[PDB]
Amino acid sequence: ELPNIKDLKSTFESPKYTKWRSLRESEDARYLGLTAPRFLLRVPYDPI
Amino acid sequence: NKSLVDQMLVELDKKISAQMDEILHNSQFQAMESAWRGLKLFVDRTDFRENNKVEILHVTKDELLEDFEFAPETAQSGLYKHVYSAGYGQFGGEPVGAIIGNYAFTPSTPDMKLLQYMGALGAMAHAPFISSVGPEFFGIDSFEELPNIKDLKSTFESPKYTKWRSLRESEDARYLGLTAPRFLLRVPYDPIENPVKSFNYAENVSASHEHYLWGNTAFAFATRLTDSFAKYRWCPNIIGPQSGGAVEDLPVHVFESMGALQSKIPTEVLITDRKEFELAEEGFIALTMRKGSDNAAFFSANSIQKPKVFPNTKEGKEAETNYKLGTQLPYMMIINRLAHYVKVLQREQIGAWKERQDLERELNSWIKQYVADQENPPADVRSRRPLRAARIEVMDVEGNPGWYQVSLSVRPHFKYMGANFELSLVGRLDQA
Amino acid sequence: SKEGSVAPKERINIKYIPATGDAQAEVELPLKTLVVGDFKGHAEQTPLEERATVTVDKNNFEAVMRESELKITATVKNKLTDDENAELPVELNFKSLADFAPDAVASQVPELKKLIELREALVAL
């Protein structure tokens, strides 16, 4: 549903993300990196 | 079939949690928990490798009064023995830097008397006594009605506060500091945000915010003192968002509003700048909440003592300046450490061959150690060397050879604590 | 002795002496705070001047709680039934901060502990 999100910047203004917002301002945040969508590891089993 | 079994589990846990709420929201239980939880909150934000220490002394307010009233004089009180006698006044010992009292004070005569004694003790040991104020001090049920108070200054004109008003005029009031609203120690238990094992417990905070585990702000203030010392071995950097009076990483709690969402404020209320200033004028240390964040800050640390007004003349205004410096804890902490260093280092010199001018020479060379008298030293230097100028005079105690009378006067760097701005549009202004 | 030892006097005497001049050595003072408060559920019989202070730090905080021995004897409304006259008295004991968790509270209250045991039995379906 990522295509249905009209604006992530505005989404992150919610009180819900208070701690995350503070995390991003810490001088230790330079050593954190998080990735977004996953990816396929296996093609579904198939006779061919 | 299992669906019905699951419903049984739902109702079982429902009932269990209803009971669990009663224990966790029990005032006796919370008293115990908040004491120790708040204590750790303090302890683990300090750094014991920086020569910081802390001791616990179990005492109730009631038995503090018992002891102070029992003793004939403060010099024979049990607390005095623990603070002064076994520390500051003992060769080979060490002096207590500050005393943190985990108490809430009201305008009640017992509370007033207790503060009087603590002021005396702090004065003698040269260590401030910090604690907190109860909501009822302001005539309100809880701190959540502070926005409804139209004027604190006028509130304190009531006969009700007679003793408090006299307390603020005492020369011992410099060693008292009381904080205003409390702050959250614990986020309510929640399957997602704060889960427990086995039992599916979801804590239900009711309409009463006293269900929240509130903690004593004095401990927050105490960590401010520790940080300043840890970095500089001095305690003046405790009154600003950037200077070091910022309290970072407060608990948050988003919950449903009127169909929207909102977070319980870490402090009971969101103090406005005007309200904060009012509290400052009345000698309270208000921890203010930074709106929309998890950060709070102490904008100033005025003591209980009320400033004196002098005649509007060169000399009179200098008197005001001097007295006001005395009324503020960021400067008194400088004096306090100086007192402690003098006591210790001078005892080592007893019995040495010193004539009057020998003390002037040596004491001058000593005090220079903490002076930064440069055109423009950086804030870091100003922090570790809090003084800008110092003056020492030594006289003789006539009729008592080997005894001297020493006067030490210092001029600290000033903290930025307010300003007025006049804005104006102008044509033909000189070009910068 | 901090005087420094030398040999008996000879024609040639050699001694190491640290060049500190007349500088007065000094001792750094710690910042010690005293936290005073009602850390137990009851007042002590021991006089204030007699009861001692406890040094606390990060490496022994829990040990201090254990040694201090905390206990709460209290009564709460019994909401496990439908009777306003029903009251529940508990005797909680704490050794560390973990003991203030609901998990521990249940384990020390039979009236709830048994219900947790029941819960687990029902889950075992």
Automatic annotation (TrEMBL), chain A:
Source organism, top-level taxon: Bacteria
Protein name: Type VI secretion system contractile sheath large subunit
Organism: Vibrio cholerae serotype O1 (strain ATCC 39315 / El Tor Inaba N16961)
Native organism taxonomy: Bacteria, Pseudomonadati, Pseudomonadota, Gammaproteobacteria, Vibrionales
Parent-protein start and end of this portion: 205 to 252 of 492
TrEMBL record, chain C:
Name of the protein in question: Type VI secretion system contractile sheath small subunit
Native source organism of the sequence: Vibrio cholerae serotype O1 (strain ATCC 39315 / El Tor Inaba N16961)
Included stretch of the parent chain: 2 to 126 of 168
